[PDB]
């Protein structure tokens, strides 16, 4: 059973928009962003950055 599903939208940083998405055509698997006055990072699949 689901006890809860926290869904959020995080911005893609400038250094990821230019250097990753626009240059290589890929996106990082980790979201590092400021939410509720705190720096939070989420790793996809609870794995390493890819």
């Amino acid at each position: 059973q689901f006890m809860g599903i926290f869904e959020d939208r995080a911005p893609v940083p400038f250094e990821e928009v230019i250097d990753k998405i626009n240059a290589k055509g890929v996106c990082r698997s980790t979201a590092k962003y400021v939410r509720n006055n705190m720096e939070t990072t989420a790793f996809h699949r609870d794995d390493h950055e890819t």
Binding site: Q1, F2, M3, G4
Partner: protein, 50 residues
């Protein structure tokens, strides 16, 4: 002088008419929604409050 007489006059065809305009109203019908609100609440019970 030989001056002209009254014009011929318009010939009118008596009849019946129905005037249709473009349809803009959406097609409406009756539907039924079956669903379930699943609400799972996490409560922390303090000393004097919840």
């Amino acid at each position: 002088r030989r001056c002209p007489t009254r014009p011929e006059g318009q010939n009118y065809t008596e009849g019946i008419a129905v005037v249709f305009k473009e349809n803009i109203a959406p097609y409406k019908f009756k539907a039924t929604m079956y669903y379930k609100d699943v609400t799972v609440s996490q409560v922390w019970f303090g000393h004097r409050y919840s």
